[PDB]
Amino acid sequence: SNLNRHIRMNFETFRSLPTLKNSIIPLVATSKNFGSLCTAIKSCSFLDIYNKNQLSNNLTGRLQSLSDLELAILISAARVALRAKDGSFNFNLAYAEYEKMIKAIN
């Protein structure tokens, strides 16, 4: 079942019953009637939505909210930091990398 799968995932990752309770509580509370609650506990799709929302402000979700110029400046700064030995950079070197990249694209 899906509920046993989510319990197994918690057992391998968190091993915490308060962690599972914090997801089970809005599964119970957002149901409107008995059949909706039964379908929610049979499917556990709200647990998947909860798990998606718990990672929405991580590095992956913050990268997916970036614009084209923001992503370009970030890639340029990462290139300058990877080429540097201390991993350090400033605005000038990152802008030089961005400008070289835009000329090589155009």
Binding site: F11, E12, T13, K52, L55, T60
Partner: protein, 485 residues
Amino acid sequence: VIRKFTKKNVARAKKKYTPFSKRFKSIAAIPDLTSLPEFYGNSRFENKLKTTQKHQIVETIFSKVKKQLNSSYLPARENEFASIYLSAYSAIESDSATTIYVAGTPGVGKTLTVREVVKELLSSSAQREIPDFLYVEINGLKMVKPTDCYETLWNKVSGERLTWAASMESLEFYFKRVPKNKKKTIVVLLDELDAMVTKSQDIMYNFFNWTTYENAKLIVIAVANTMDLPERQLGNKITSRIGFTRIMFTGYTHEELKNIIDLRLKGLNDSFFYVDTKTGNAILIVRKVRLRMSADAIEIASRKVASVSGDARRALKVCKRAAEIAEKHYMAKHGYGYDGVQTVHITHVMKALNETLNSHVITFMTRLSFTAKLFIYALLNLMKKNGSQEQELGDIVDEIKLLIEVNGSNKFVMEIAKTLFQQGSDNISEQLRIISWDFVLNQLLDAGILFKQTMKNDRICCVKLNISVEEAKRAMNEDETLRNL
């Protein structure tokens, strides 16, 4: 008037500021302080913690044993007792001022011996072989501020309540200028002397310099942790004033600990009790039950504790824990609640002694989740390759990623890789950290397994093992998955 800040929780004691040196016209005008009502000490809270009992509480056979072995309720301290009593008696009889230095490890009977010396001196003064004296006891760890000792001792001498500087000058004037026929001998116990050490050593110098005064009639018994406390933390003046003849309280041997425990259990070992079988209440002289605690168990407990510390508290607590274990098994097997031979065996003593010896670090790491174990395993691999003892967190991230992607044919890794990187879900993207990454990081930091550097860059922040490496490996060698790869 508009105030730049407010102190609305000021609690000021009603203590006066005028010292003892300015309340009489001259030295020759000071009266006899022995014939004064407030001087030299010539409980209101005990009623507040009493209630009515409406249940007859059931005290089993082991209850008298466990109450008997409490530290609150001297076969081995007879030379230390003789030395301290001889020095204090000679200083009281000759109206002399002196210092008696006593030091030792915890629980070797220093405070007990000093209090027994003081009680025997009071018994001697009661039947008039020595002049009467005042007894003051000052513990350095029971003071809110270290200067409170100044406020305490003077309040025990004069009955006045002053501030600490005024009390210090009052004590200085009393010890230096008041004649010996006008005052009384004072014996002061300074317990936990290392807590009375300040940065400038004012109190230490004052307390051991008053003993060098002619008119003081002050005896200071200073109780400390070590012999070389003045030679380590005090100046040469205080070390010179304390003296050279310093009294060692060595740890107890196993015969002395065995004699202490047998002197506790003198009247109740190998004895008979009337025990009601329906309830378990035991009455010293319905079944007549014979209670014993074996001398071999007490002996080996005395041997182990004497080899470790010589602490009488530790030996009494080990015997009390063994009695508690025996009583727990007894009340479990007899169905006894709370309202023919009972023996505290040697296995209970060995269960009590090993309970503070079993280590829950390996047991704790054995029962962690897979991701915390993977963190620890990847950290151990990084310590194996680069040998740094401090690994960057980004290195741990890439090593966890590498260990997942290399052992991609392992069945458990195939079953769990989507759990670590997508939480078993489509519509969740491939994550850069594993699921419960900061959860297991904070869990290992809370347990004290790891140390983390205070940096705000998550990748180049370093993490160090706080425990030994072989117990971590041992815990990693118990798991069936991390053994295979």
